[PDB]
């Protein structure tokens, strides 16, 4: 919030790893959604 807390290096690396996992999961989800949209276009044109 307003006051800055102190975070240890272990906590910081763990938080960064969690954020990286979150973003890679979002990327995989977006890739599967792209696959679904592409399949929709292909079977609409077929």
């Amino acid at each position: 919030e307003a006051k800055p807390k102190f975070l240890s290096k272990a906590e910081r690396e763990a938080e960064a790893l969690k954020r990286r996992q979150q973003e890679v999961e979002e990327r995989q989800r977006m890739l599967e959604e792209e696959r679904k949209k592409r399949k929709q276009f292909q079977d609409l044109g077929r």
Partner: protein, 49 residues
């Protein structure tokens, strides 16, 4: 924690929210500011140790 509190009083903190790039920062977010403050304070304390 008291070290971070003491830093909260200096001028450097005041500018660390307006011109972050000058201080190798990447964002004005509280997360980034806290991470950078913790890193610098831990580094200085480790060097002193």
């Amino acid at each position: 924690q008291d070290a971070v509190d003491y830093l909260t009083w200096t001028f450097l903190y005041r500018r660390m929210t307006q011109n972050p790039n000058y201080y190798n920062l990447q964002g004005i977010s509280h997360r980034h500011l806290s991470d950078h403050l913790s890193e610098l304070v831990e580094q200085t304390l480790s060097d002193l140790e």
